[PDB]
Symmetry: C2
Subunit: 134 residues, 2 copies
Amino acid sequence: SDLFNEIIPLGRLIHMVNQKKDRLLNEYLSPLDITAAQFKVLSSIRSAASITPVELKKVLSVDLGALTRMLDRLVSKGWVERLPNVLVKLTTGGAAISEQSHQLVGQDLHQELTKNLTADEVATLEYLLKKVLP
Amino acid sequence: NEIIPLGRLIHMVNQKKDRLLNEYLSPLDITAAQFKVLSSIRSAASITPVELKKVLSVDLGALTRMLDRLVSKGWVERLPNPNDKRGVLVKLTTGGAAISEQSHQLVGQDLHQELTKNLTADEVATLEYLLKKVLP
């Protein structure tokens, strides 16, 4: 709590808290040699069903090159398949691992993130974060 | 509209910040990802790629590519390492300083005002307060 003495801007706070989330993800996901970054790519493909690398790049806001490397690794692991249109989609086993991740990682991440918060502080934080998104 | 977990909300709000950064930074052909790298070097003054990878939590390979691009643009320079010699320090050129220095205005003003457009002043103070409480 040099943080409460000091005035840190909101954008910086959002960044730091997102770093903390990603470190916690990386820890809980570690039992599948899947990174937080790979996890997000898988989730994005899951919700889109099928999606261009070009379209995926745009949804994720990351470099096209860096994403091709990500997609290479995820195909080698059998979690993603490349189809003729290019279009990337989840394998049946990448669907499994997406499913296992979410069940493995939720609750735990929520409880570690909110450990210092009151129940109503959690509800307020969630409320106000939603208000930023419109 | 529904009950979205905190972790997910943090992600979505962080995505939104990055998209706004990418828009405002577009007049330099500099990405939010690049801008973060420059800021990290700024505050470290000089830093290993290995130490930088750790501070940024990105792949070493992907960071070497980032650093290649920023050297070609003249915002970062590679130096001989005093302790290693087979290795290098990166630091900002004066141009890279001028650009990373713009992080005060960008994150604190423009980006800040777009993020908080739907918030009351006290709602901003509360959101900041509670985000700080997650960090310990």
